[PDB]
Design a protein around this ligand. Sequence first.
Ligand SMILES: Nc1ncnc2c1ncn2[C@@H]1O[C@H](COP(=O)(O)OP(=O)(O)OP(=O)(O)O)[C@@H](O)[C@H]1O
Ligand SMILES: Nc1ncnc2c1ncn2[C@@H]1O[C@H](COP(=O)(O)OP(=O)(O)O)[C@@H](O)[C@H]1O
Ligand SMILES: [Mg+2]
Ligand SMILES: [Mg+2]
Lengths: 466, 456, 53, 477, 128, 128, 35
Amino acid sequence: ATGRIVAVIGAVVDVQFDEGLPPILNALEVQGRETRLVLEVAQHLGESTVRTIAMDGTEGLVRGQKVLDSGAPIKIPVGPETLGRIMNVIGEPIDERGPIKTKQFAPIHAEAPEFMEMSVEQEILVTGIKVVDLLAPYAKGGKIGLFGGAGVGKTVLIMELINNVAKAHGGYSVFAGVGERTREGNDLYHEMIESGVINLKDATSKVALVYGQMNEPPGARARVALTGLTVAEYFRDQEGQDVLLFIDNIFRFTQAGSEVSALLGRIPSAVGYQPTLATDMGTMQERITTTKKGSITSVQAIYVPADDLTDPAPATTFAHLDATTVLSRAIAELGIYPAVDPLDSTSRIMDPNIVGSEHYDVARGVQKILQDYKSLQDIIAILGMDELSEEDKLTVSRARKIQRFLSQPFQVAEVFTGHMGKLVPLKETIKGFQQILAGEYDHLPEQAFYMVGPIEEAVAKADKLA
Amino acid sequence: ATGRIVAVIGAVVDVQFDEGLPPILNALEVQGRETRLVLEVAQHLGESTVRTIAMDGTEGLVRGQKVLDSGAPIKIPVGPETLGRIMNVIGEPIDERGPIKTKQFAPIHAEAPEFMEMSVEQEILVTGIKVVDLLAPYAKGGKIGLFGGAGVGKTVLIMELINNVAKAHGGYSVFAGVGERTREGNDLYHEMIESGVINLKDATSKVALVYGQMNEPPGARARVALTGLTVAEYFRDQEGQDVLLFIDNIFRFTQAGSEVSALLGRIPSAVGYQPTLATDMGTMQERITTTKKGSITSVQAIYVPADDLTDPAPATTFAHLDATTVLSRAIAELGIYPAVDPLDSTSRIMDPNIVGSEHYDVARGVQKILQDYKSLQDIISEEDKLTVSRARKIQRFLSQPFQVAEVFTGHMGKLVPLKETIKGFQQILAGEYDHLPEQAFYMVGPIEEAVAKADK
Amino acid sequence: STTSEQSARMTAMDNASKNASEMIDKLTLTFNRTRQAVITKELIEIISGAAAL
Amino acid sequence: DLEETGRVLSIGDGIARVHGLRNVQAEEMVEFSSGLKGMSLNLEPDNVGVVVFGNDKLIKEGDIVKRTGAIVDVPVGEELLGRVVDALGNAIDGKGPIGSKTRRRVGLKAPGIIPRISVREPMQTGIKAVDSLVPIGRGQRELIIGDRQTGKTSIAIDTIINQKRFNDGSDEKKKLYCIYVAIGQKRSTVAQLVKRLTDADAMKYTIVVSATASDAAPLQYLAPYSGCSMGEYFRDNGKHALIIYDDLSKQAVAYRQMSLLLRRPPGREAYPGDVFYLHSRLLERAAKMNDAFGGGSLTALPVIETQAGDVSAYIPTNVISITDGQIFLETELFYKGIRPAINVGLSVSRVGSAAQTRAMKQVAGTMKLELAQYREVADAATQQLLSRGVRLTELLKQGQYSPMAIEEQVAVIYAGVRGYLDKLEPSKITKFENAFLSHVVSQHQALLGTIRADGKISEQSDAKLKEIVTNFLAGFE
Amino acid sequence: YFRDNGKHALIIYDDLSKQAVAYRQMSLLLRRPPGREAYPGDVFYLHSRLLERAAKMNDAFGGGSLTALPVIETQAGDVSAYIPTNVISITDGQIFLETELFYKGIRPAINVGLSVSRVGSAAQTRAM
Amino acid sequence: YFRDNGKHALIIYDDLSKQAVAYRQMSLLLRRPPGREAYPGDVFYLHSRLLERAAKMNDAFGGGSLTALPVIETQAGDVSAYIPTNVISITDGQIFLETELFYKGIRPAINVGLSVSRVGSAAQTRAM
Amino acid sequence: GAGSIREAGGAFGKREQAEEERYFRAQSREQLAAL
Ligand SMILES: Nc1ncnc2c1ncn2[C@@H]1O[C@H](COP(=O)(O)OP(=O)(O)OP(=O)(O)O)[C@@H](O)[C@H]1O
Ligand SMILES: Nc1ncnc2c1ncn2[C@@H]1O[C@H](COP(=O)(O)OP(=O)(O)O)[C@@H](O)[C@H]1O
Ligand SMILES: [Mg+2]
Ligand SMILES: [Mg+2]
């Protein structure tokens, strides 16, 4: 079927068909372009006219330009041949290594797994990060979301997780860069080549990369996450593999939809977002899941606009996650890194019957003492430290020591900090925090717990200060 | 070109033409009215219809009433014959003294001076006022935010700036009463008449008044600043003068622009301001500058909504301000006149590369000793009583008698040159007058008058 | 001890006033920010209600 | 002929609805009968919406709009160096037309992942605080964010003036061509800036793009992209360019004006939903290329003005999410005479550390550590930390329009971090600094030349440095 | 069905904020004009015509009942938001949960100061 | 009529908040573009052309006068609301009344710190 | 703004209420034994 362009507004293109109106979500190819310009049908306008979202720039489009219907949605190559390669939103290679020669192509639009396919296994996933493993531990096959404002450490944390989990991972991995820095994608590509996780010479590569970055028009930024989902879903279903899916940044998805929502002719919702924010997010996120056919452990960095966690996009994302690591700018200005907010990060396996009564008690006691410190903060700020009781001063001192000991030097942060990274086992974390809560280190200064690994390094640093 | 009214909604009038559609910003004259009604084109709506904002009330307008195209934007009489007179936004006299018999008329809409007409280095505008010239000097072709309203001698300072720029530089002044209270406009007119700045009998008037009243539609209040700026532009570009232009108030200029934009159906921006807030402010302020012929220095009264300095209207105005003069009541109730707050008044040309090293060091020493005196007063040592004495003498020597007050107080007015101010404060800081009493510096001009008052 | 204590209380209340003024300045900034945001949000609601007719 | 020409149906809100132009492309430049230009934004079934690059006063209903057949582009090349142009590439300095042979589209997409390489070589600003603590590399995007009148334009101008020591030499590799885009500034400020660059002889390698406060909002929106295209010309031909956008806050305000006049849904602070894309597609074009693409680079120093120091606002956080780090300027510091008022605990350079030279590394690692300790403290052990930190923050101060060579900065930071300043009282530090510099410039150009050619400090150069510093400190007031 | 047959039922709506969001989406896409926070004008009617169907019947109608436990998620503890205040004005009492109480060890984090039951002791056993 | 015939009149608008509300209703129903708090663009123009008609005439025009006492009700002392801001900007001063002063026994509850008269002592007698 | 410390329900309003209740329960115990 062939139609003709009748209107071009930004990323939105109206196409009028004389015969054979293409279904919604079909991919159309514009004729007369130097590169492949794909339009995805979004609405049927009536009078044999459809409204489409362009996957590339619409500059140079002329009213009346011919458009062919492919007969199917955007289909990307899926298989083990995509491992070690970089593809864009429409499945084309962008690594200059030639065609991705798979034996099967999958549409980026698919149905979410049914209710009878869901899994319930909730085994922990130790990450080596003290605050994560202690207070909001991740689960294998679960959904992890890293919230944070601009420049608080979402990319640093997700790169630390790639270093600590994906290399030690037995299955495959997919990194979907969505609306982020292109130089960050170049860094990740070359670092994965250096570390052997991507092999340019044989078929031993373990990661597939899908990049649509912040230089892309809103259609590509809205569908590149779906392309990454399709790759991970193939690896989960047809291969039965355990997949790792890193999405940085998923908020861009929502934001991209916002950018087109006005041009699609829809009445705006709260804060100018599309009225379909929650259902679009749900349609996308329900495919990011572990079924009883295969497992997908998902780590999604979630941008928080203007540091407002009540913004509709992060507020809607909160319900789709099994673990949330909420980074805070206030904690990042105290020098504590990672900037995890220990009273805002949660996990669903923080359950005595899952992590053990010892782990549960240490975590809950840490959170109790931090909440008590936060309650005292007002009086401490106005009436000074001296107007408290003895137990209040002891609580403040222990809470500050715990705040310091929650920080940790990362191996991805070695370059701009000099401090060698630390991977702290879960038992050593539980032991160190149990000991701090007990009072076994009430004599050491609080600066001794700042940016160390296990508690033995804390006592060594204490003996090195004095 | 003749058209006819097709719609009247409040202060918005849609006028349809049959030949020769008028460009945007042209003035149209409504026909068959007892008083002059002027519309200003804002948009071309299509089908030979333009939308316009009225400069006066639209009551009694009939659909089909004839409207004449004037052929240019609002044109106002410009010349030395506007000095001492009052005109409204459309240039007609509102003081009942007869027509303004200038030889030329200028359109109130003009583009800012080009790039190659700008001055490439900033110079100082000496006002003869000691605290201003020393601590927060004015730049030629700059904008000055005048803070403080009633009870701090704002009108006395305005009239003294007019008088001093007329004497020292030979440059006239324009005063634009944007959103002016009619009672306070009459008051200002009569204080200018009594203080000799306006003269109703000979041609020695120093200021020209342009009043856009508070009871006029928002278009008149949005264009009165341009009318005053057009008079000042004539005085600069045709007589090579260093003109003064007062805008009271500038927040009301922003408010009128916001109301006009809301009347035209445009979507409000943040806090309810017009979406074109920055470009409206810019198109107005960029015409206030130093060209190769002369300059226009603008003193603009700043009102801050809800005391919020990050509000869009002050935040947009502050991007154009080159200096700040804060009139404080804590200084007036202390006895000092003018009531300029010497620690809150700022300047961008208070820079050793602009005013020189000597001026900068004297001003910085004065400000440091005044801050030290505030600190010491907070706790009320060896030489700190000497700092208290020197700082009190500096506070007294910041005062000055004005000429525009000579009739009411008897004291002669002083126009202190810049060098005499710099050296007087330098000497007081060095200690050359640590024996002269405290009240030998109060209400004097140069430091020689301080020693002559100490003799007595 | 009475003189030592009166001096200490004077300095302590001075410090408390200083800290209270600091918190007042930060909260005044936050308040102006929030009131501007509230006015903008109400305008946007009214404008979107009017644009849907 | 309504295929190459159209008639204006309506004009207003900066948009012209035109009837005709059936063969016009999206984002194509059109020419109005009055001499103005526009961009085809909305191709519709019965009209074309045109964004006018100029005043709507000059366009009437019924005017003829011809189409130029070219997607919006600007003249690029070496012929723009030393010229002041507007957002469309037209010279506004009266020196005649631009003799350019090449044009480049202003909305070209940034390079992909493959054409890029890591930032490796330094972009020297000549400012001790920046070059030591927040180093910038070629191909980086470093944001200059701060309140009004905190010294942001001064940092940009010091960088541009500093590039003269490399643009005069014979090392074609180390040359850097500068572009300064003024967006919503005062016209007199831009004239005085061009005068400052002409005095310092920094105009012969600088392009100035001027869209000032009296220019229409579409021109202030277009200016950063025109400047970026002029810079991409160098980036794509093996040369290195630095671009300053002063500032992106006013470009965002101009774009919000254009968007609200198009009836588009406002969001936070009434900004459109694509105000992040507006800056992201721009600042992504600053890249370092690998050697298979010429090896050139384009460095971007965007400027952002905050309101009362709020860096968690919408536009500041957007640009912080786009760039590779930020240089915070505080009003508290600037008021206390600490200038450049760079906050060291808040500024950062993510990718610039790999670009810092080895000598500057050797001194700046110690300087940064000592400053971190001085910040984390403020007896007889921490008193030394406080003294060293006070001396170092006095050493970090600097004047205006006088950038320093990297070897002189290295010598000064050496004299600061090895401990030869703990004797002096702080109020004299600056004095010593200046005098010391003169000494090393007057009679010790050989050690400076060796440090400059070697890129590091050898034990021989370290010994000579200790000798010179001890001798000068001995006979110094 | 159970309420009308002499049997007793309990229903939990988890949660009604997401139902309000979905109704807002449907209404905005049906081009019905938005109200506060873009919600339709009749979101209160949406929830009140639902929560009025929980009732205790008399003996002539079977004696069955239907208890309703709607759930509402607030943002940053803003009980004063649109949908929270709607549902609070509808129901017969609230059980307020707090994050501070949760992390201070109080689990379930019920705020007994704010949590009210408009029925109260009328629906307790005598020992309790 | 009195101001024009050498006589002196006083007028009390009680109050202008309700007139602004009525005008806002008339304007919103005429589909005029709403502004801040849905008020039309020319509500300041409304109150300003109403209040500028109170004037003291010179002796050549009869010497009469018209004094105006507009009343404005604020919500929780918010003088930065739209209509309070407009009317405070238009008038020559304001008598500000408080609730704390009222219940502290101070009746009339005139806050003298916040009250101001810009005419001042020119409107007094030599004894006062 | 009289009584705004207790009205804000912060860490200072809770301690104010605790102080009032402590003092006046002590005074009530002192006044009941003398009745
Ligand atoms: N390093 C410095 N040393 C001394 N003075 C300085 C320094 N930097 C800036 N200044 C002074 O502070 C003034 C304002 O600095 P500058 O204009 O560069 O900052 P800005 O943030 O761009 O201001 P604006 O908001 O107007 O754009 C300058 O005129 C200059 O005199
Ligand atoms: N774990 C960390 N340790 C030290 N610094 C960090 C850490 N995480 C973030 N930072 C600092 O915050 C900056 C921003 O890092 P990044 O993760 O890229 O921000 P974003 O949240 O936007 O992804 C880093 O350059 C670094 O200076
Ligand atoms: Mg990131
Ligand atoms: Mg600047």
